[PDB]
Amino acid sequence: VNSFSGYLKLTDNVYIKNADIVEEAKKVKPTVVVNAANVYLKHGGGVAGALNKATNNAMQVESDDYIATNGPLKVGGSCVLSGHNLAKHCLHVVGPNVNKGEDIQLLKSAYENFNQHEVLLAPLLSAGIFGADPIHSLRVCVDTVRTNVYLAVFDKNLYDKLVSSFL
Ligand SMILES: Nc1ncnc(N2C[C@H]3CC[C@@H]2CC3)c1Cl
C-alpha cells in the first residue's frame, strides 16, 4: 500500500492522475519525483522550472554544482539528486527535445531510468515544451517501465485525451 490517491490504473504498474507534479509532490513526499530535465540541468520552464521554483531555486544551485563537477548528462540519461522539500530524491531524466531535433527513439532509453526505482512520482516525458506527442510518450512509458509509476499530468484536455485513447 502507498499514499498516492485519486489515480486511474492503466496497467499492472502504471497509474495516471490530473495533478501538478509540484502539488502532488508536496502532498505525498514520494521517495522519488522525476524531473523533465535537460542535459545542462537548467530548470527554465514546465516540470523543471516549476519544480525548481517550488524549491526556492535550491534545485538549481545543487544542479549547477553537479554540472560543474560531472559535465552535462546524455540525452536519454539521468542523475539522482536531492528532492529538497518535494521528495527524498529527484531523478533528473533527459527525454529528447523534438524542438532541438533529438531522436525520439531516445525516449525509450529515458524511461528505462525509471526501472532503477521501485516507485516514482513522475511526469509525462517529452511532453509539453519538449515537443513530443504525449500519447506516444504514454505508450513508451507503459511498454518500458516495469516499476510502479504514478504519472501526475497537470492538464485536463490532455489527461482526458490520454485516458480516452489508451489501448
Ligand atoms: N507542473 C506540471 N505537472 C505535471 N505536468 C506538467 N506538464 C505536463 C504536460 C507537459 C509539461 C507540462 C504541461 C502539460 C507540469 Cl508543467
From Swiss-Prot:
Origin: domain of life: Viruses
Subcellular location(s) per record: Host endoplasmic reticulum membrane
Residue ranges of domain Macro in the record: 1-167
Catalytic activity annotation: Thiol-dependent hydrolysis of ester, thioester, amide, peptide and isopeptide bonds formed by the C-terminal Gly of ubiquitin (a 76-residue protein attached to proteins as an intracellular targeting signal)
Membrane topology of the entry: Multi-pass membrane protein
Activity regulation information from UniProt: Inhibited in vitro by GRL-0617.
Subunit note: May form homohexamers. Interacts with N protein.
Function per UniProt: Responsible for the cleavages located at the N-terminus of the replicase polyprotein. Participates together with nsp4 in the assembly of virally-induced cytoplasmic double-membrane vesicles necessary for viral replication. Antagonizes innate immune induction of type I interferon by blocking the phosphorylation, dimerization and subsequent nuclear translocation of host IRF3. Also prevents host NF-kappa-B signaling. In addition, PL-PRO possesses a deubiquitinating/deISGylating activity and processes both 'Lys-48'- and 'Lys-63'-linked polyubiquitin chains from cellular substrates.
Protein name, UniProt field: Papain-like protease nsp3
Species name: Severe acute respiratory syndrome coronavirus 2
Taxonomic placement: Viruses, Riboviria, Orthornavirae, Pisuviricota, Pisoniviricetes
Full-length numbering of the shown residues: 1025 to 1191 of 7096
